[PDB]
Design a protein around this ligand. Structure first.
Ligand SMILES: CCCCC[C@H](CC(=O)NO)C(=O)N[C@H](C(=O)N1CCC[C@H]1CO)C(C)C
Ligand SMILES: CCCCC[C@H](CC(=O)NO)C(=O)N[C@H](C(=O)N1CCC[C@H]1CO)C(C)C
Ligand SMILES: CCCCC[C@H](CC(=O)NO)C(=O)N[C@H](C(=O)N1CCC[C@H]1CO)C(C)C
Ligand SMILES: [Mn+2]
Ligand SMILES: [Mn+2]
Ligand SMILES: [Mn+2]
Ligand SMILES: [Mn+2]
Ligand SMILES: [Mn+2]
Ligand SMILES: [Mn+2]
Lengths: 537, 537, 537
């Protein structure tokens, strides 16, 4: 295993990567759900979170940790605030920590109506006092239809599994010391009751939780450990677990087979570039079932190339493989759901995920500001800034997915931590969606509201983008000739040009540079956006 | 006149400003329209511009400059290109210059379907060879419904009236040497035929042309000439011409009457701050007629304050009164249309325009990064960056318009060259619209497509904006505590907070920092957006 | 009052400054102390804070809010952490909020052994839930000798009195909604028992609390309100209250009487420069009693002059009058203590405080990088950077205090928010002390450890500083000719050169640029350092 791997020159380093792989390939979330109608014990710690109306309801006096101190906490909580206390509750002996959090009063049209953001903030703050081996009970007052946003909001708010604090290096950088037990007021996960005529079950919410958290792990892991060879070995194990076809083009194979864009970007790095694609044909696909290809930026580290980033922009480029992991782990959850019941993604015939893997490293073998590169699609590109490497590798990615597979997709989802312009456009919680079909734009926005992985449209206007990418000696450049030329859209437009001409349906580009991480680290963004988006028709 | 004015200490300077005022108060466009069915002569220069289909039609052999060289030019023009020639045409003796331009093949959903951008590029390039006193005939092949976009596209593409080249200073910086004669293939302006059941007539298109070009003049004029006292004198003359009510709050009157935000911003400048508001009650208002208030950033020069801008960001801050002029000149055109026929803006009862006038100047009396200012609305503001001055003055503007007039608006339109984040968001041709009502957002986008003054939504999410404006000692700051916090929306949100609580309908903020100008200078952006937006219901 | 003042041209602005003055001239802290042996009621909110040993002692079961939930909180608190709960306690009806905070386990030689920093962090976090008109009880487990550090640590951690949130502008920017009641385990304040043979009484701790908080108010107030004329009017009222001599040199009087350094710095500003000095002869001075002059940088706003600071370095220059306020409010407390008992500062004959008041403003009348200025001391200075304005004004300050008063000081204390080099040197909690006498250095360090206003020596080496201030055409420059030339010491050395030759005892320069403020704003730093320093012999 450690000897199979073509990675480092070192037994010790290789032995520890073999363990890191395991923690990734057998990963399980540390979230459980319990049917509110079957609560018989109460955890060492309890969080209660909901709309102020719902918290003050008499329906809550049933919950098994109700008692006078808790009742008092409910008199004192105001919209947006928190009240915390110890209490002697039945359902436990001794004292129990109860934290009570009201969600905010007002929500706007562009935000998730269940307020999954506040749920995450409230969860995170309750986990801080949970001791090794204990459980945090999370009591959520959210209406039926909110299950996936809750599963996401909680999963992503748990203490992160990647750490090296206090010796964890010796245990594969993996810590899952505590545990979250979700108790929703709605029972739809347990009854399979239909909401907007769709059902989502408990085994699915676990698959989401596992996938969101695997996503936080891969993102959070530094590139000294999660490089392109390791990331690829992981993808292989998930391939053999799920029983799916896998296509890998690696290193010189990229250049030999004409993927000049991604080979150029990753040619300098210690460990080489890969296009890795996993795909499943659904055996229970219905007559109407569409085909879906997904593509993600797997830049394991972005140093900037020769357009080397400064120190303060370069940290966190750990996370520049976020788009990649979002769609990779969404693939896993979707396929897992497909294997659970005949009907679950019945309207999907083929699903494909393409990982565009590479480190953008700086050195003699670096692609230069001025190099001219011939992408797989045939289009020639004049590299003006080597730090716009995402565009390029993704260009070869989307061409592979649209023009080299044995089925033609009917929709292409591009996901990438692409640009800082994104943050200026749409802030740090909403991804930027650059979409060639108004209906697919609306639908992605909506899957964002339902999922709690928010989204917002950015300018789609190829005629205007075309005219800031003009090169004197190639088909296009890879950065615009002007400042303040709608920077996130320009990133999408670049990638759009490399779609095989045989592909005729929507191209949906999700730029999630800022939403992919926050103070605590990786958010898992993307995993639940895609699950929703694909689940809804 | 020159002695009435409380401006400079100088007879000469004051004599020349009196002339500059005149050129502004009697301004007329230099655009005419001629009914295509009544063309009897052909101009020294001719431009033909349209969709390639429409150009190659046999319908064109009728135009009075048809001849073999022209026919040949039509064989050679390809989509997007230009062909130019001299020809002996009947309708003139001697040779005539004919330029033939095909509009582009493909347009996207976010752009004007008539391609008013290409029309403007094509016009501009034909005007360059027109000699003093001559006429350029502009033959446009555009379908009925495109009249306002054409009037705009052409008006704004003429050589600019503000110049000091070759002695023009002695003629009030005003040059209108040539003239454009528009000949559209559609006759709807001349027949009053209904399109989508609305009619627009020739006297209206002239009012638009005049207003777009007055807008380019005011914007283009430097602040050594167009300062707040002069800009105010102009607004007064237009008030007395159109017979409307005018309210001016000036200098110490602002501070005495509680407009701390705008008084703070402009207190350092040579010439003082003004809130200037013009308003008309429509005598022919129908039963349903709504009320409309408009507000614009009139920062005549933005030096940055003490957060002084560098040299290269500071040039063109001439144009930082663009939002102001767009809505001011839209007011003029709208009111002019109202005075033309009983029915023309029948669904509008009251219209108001508020100019937020001030120079952001640097000096001892400057408002500081740390000053705390009490806006008219009562909300206290902690100034962290004095270069976000637009927010502030506009804050007092919208409060005046929503809370101090003798009618309550049902819609507030805020227009401002507000932020560079705008350019990063939505490029240099599309304004950023920050809108509190999804229907009003869609409607503004649409008035942009019909008008050729383009637009694109930006994130509306006050819950997320609220949390980056937190101050420890005031209600809010005036810049966000984070980079990449959706910068254009944050600008709108700041202004939104100062709306009087009595105002209950949509707030539509248009951030047009980049679309307000291009290489040649001021575009007139805003004038035709607002005309369309208000004309459609 | 509002008409006496030579300030603004405005009745409204002047009426509100008259009220701001009042809030400053009648200021009282909102801290009280209660003898632990006489606690009969318990407040709505309670904080318990101490060393873990002391918290777990059985001595605590007596406190009137002891009960089982509280007992449980004490089992759970670990060194450095916090535990919070509601409880039914006797001493109150209903529920009471109890927060329990353990101070940190380990302290180093350069920090206050009572850990006044953690006390402040713990207080601040308990005040956040206290409602209008309520009381927070603060139970501190600290040994006798810690009274002044506690009075300081708590006073400075209260919610700040300067605010404009929610209409406070209409109530003079003054909010004191809640109240803190300190209950120390030691009774030395109440018994007058001697510690290291010195006693400190309750009326003194109140005078400290009042002075620390007046200091936070003056600092926190922006310069649009707290300018040099207002700051001077305040100093006058405190002069007439305390019955002390006052000398003011203002505006042209500075230049006429030879104070070129400070007149130069402040000549550009809206409101003019002042040297303001307050001084008391102690009627109960003992035979040995020394004389003490104090001097502080009162730069009410530092824009940088023509060496204009960028936006992000310029905010918080509100606080550039911190050194000034520290020593001003220390003067008040000391004098107040003197008036309380015959013996209290018996070893002090004369005390003097000199405020070096000015705004460093940018404009035509600005002192330039290249101007040569003749300080009061006769020494000529070549201004190379106008943003090193503190040095200069303080130079005239120390000369006044050492050479123009009717007594000669035996020690000069210079206090100033002088340099950013300070932060690089000694961090954000320790001031930099540049001291001409090793014994006075040690003593100031020690008054810092006892007071909780920390301190740390910086390089004293005039022979090395002399050689980086060489000018070709003046006695010295005002900034060093080299980067990384011990920047905080160089600031002190500049000021040292302007001491009158008649002054022969120690010069102690305290550079407190970073310790003067934190996230929440002004810390009051300086007030309690000086009280301690002077109290100890
Ligand atoms: C033109 C540079 C390439 C655009 C894409 C990069 C983001 C990136 O590195 N993707 O791989 C970017 O936006 N970088 C930001 C950026 O805009 N930069 C980089 C240096 C200055 C400024 C120039 O646009 C930083 C500051 C977050
Ligand atoms: C935070 C500054 C205030 C935001 C608004 C200004 C635009 C403005 O001056 N309006 O009056 C801006 O975006 N300025 C741009 C900008 O973003 N700046 C200014 C200096 C660096 C950078 C900081 O955001 C420039 C470069 C076009
Ligand atoms: C040489 C400048 C004058 C030294 C004193 C100033 C602090 C000050 O302004 N006092 O009134 C300083 O240290 N400023 C800092 C500083 O060191 N600067 C200012 C700009 C760059 C750098 C140069 O030393 C800033 C960044 C906190
Ligand atoms: Mn990247
Ligand atoms: Mn990059
Ligand atoms: Mn501006
Ligand atoms: Mn500005
Ligand atoms: Mn200073
Ligand atoms: Mn300075």
């Amino acid at each position: 295993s450690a000897m199979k791997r073509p990675r480092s020159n070192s037994i010790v380093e290789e032995t520890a990567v073999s363990a890191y792989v395991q923690t990734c390939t057998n990963f399980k979330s540390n979230v459980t759900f319990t049917d509110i109608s079957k609560v018989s014990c109460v955890a060492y710690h309890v969080l209660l979170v909901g709309a102020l109306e719902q918290l003050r309801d008499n329906s809550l006096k049933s919950v098994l940790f109700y008692c006078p101190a808790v009742a008092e906490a409910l008199q004192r909580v105001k919209a947006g605030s928190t009240v915390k206390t110890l209490a002697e509750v039945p359902g436990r002996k001794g004292y129990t920590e109860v934290m009570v959090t009201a969600l905010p009063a007002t929500t706007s049209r562009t935000n998730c109506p269940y307020r999954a953001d506040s749920m995450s903030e409230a969860v995170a703050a309750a986990c801080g006092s949970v001791e090794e081996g204990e459980v945090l009970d999370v009591y959520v007052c959210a209406p039926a239809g909110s299950e996936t946003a809750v599963a996401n909001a909680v999963a992503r708010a748990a203490p992160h599994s990647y750490t090296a604090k206090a010796g964890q290096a010796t245990k594969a950088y993996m810590k899952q010391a505590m545990s979250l037990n979700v108790v929703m007021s709605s029972r739809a996960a347990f009854t399979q009751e239909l909401v907007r005529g769709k059902s989502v079950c408990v085994a699915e919410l676990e698959a989401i939780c596992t996938s969101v958290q695997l996503c936080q792990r891969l993102v959070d892991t530094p590139p000294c450990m999660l490089d392109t060879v390791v990331y690829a070995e992981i993808a292989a194990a998930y391939a053999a677990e799920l029983g799916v076809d896998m296509t890998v083009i690696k290193g010189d194979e990229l250049r030999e087979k004409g993927y000049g864009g991604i080979y150029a970007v990753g040619k300098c790095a210690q460990y080489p570039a890969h296009l890795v694609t996993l795909r499943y044909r659904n055996p229970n696909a219905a007559e109407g079932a569409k085909n879906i290809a997904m593509v993600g930026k797997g830049i394991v580290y972005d140093c900037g190339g020769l357009a080397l980033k400064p120190a303060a922009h370069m940290t966190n480029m750990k996370t520049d493989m976020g788009g990649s992991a979002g769609v990779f782990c969404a693939f896993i959850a979707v396929v897992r759901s497909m294997k659970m019941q005949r009907t679950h993604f019945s309207h999907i015939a083929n699903i494909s995920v393409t990982l565009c893997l590479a480190e953008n490293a700086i050195g003699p073998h670096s692609y230069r500001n001025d190099d001219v590169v011939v992408m797989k699609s045939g289009k020639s590109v004049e590299v003006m800034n080597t730090d716009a490497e995402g565009r390029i590798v993704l260009g070869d990615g989307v061409y592979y997915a649209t023009g080299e597979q044995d089925f033609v997709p009917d929709v292409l989802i591009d996901m990438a931590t692409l640009t800082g312009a994104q943050g200026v456009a749409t802030g740090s919680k909403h991804a930027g969606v650059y979409a060639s079909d108004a209906e697919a734009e609306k639908d992605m926005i909506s899957a964002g509201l339902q999922s709690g992985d928010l989204c917002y449209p950015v300018l789609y206007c190829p005629e205007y983008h075309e005219e800031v990418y003009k090169s004197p000696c190639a088909d296009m450049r890879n950065i615009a000739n002007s400042s303040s030329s709608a920077g996130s859209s320009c990133g999408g437009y670049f990638v759009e040009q490399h779609l095989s001409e045989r592909f005729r349906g929507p191209f949906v580009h999700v730029d999630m540079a800022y939403p992919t991480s926050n103070t605590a680290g990786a958010t898992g963004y993307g995993v639940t956006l895609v699950f929703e988006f694909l689940r809804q028709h």
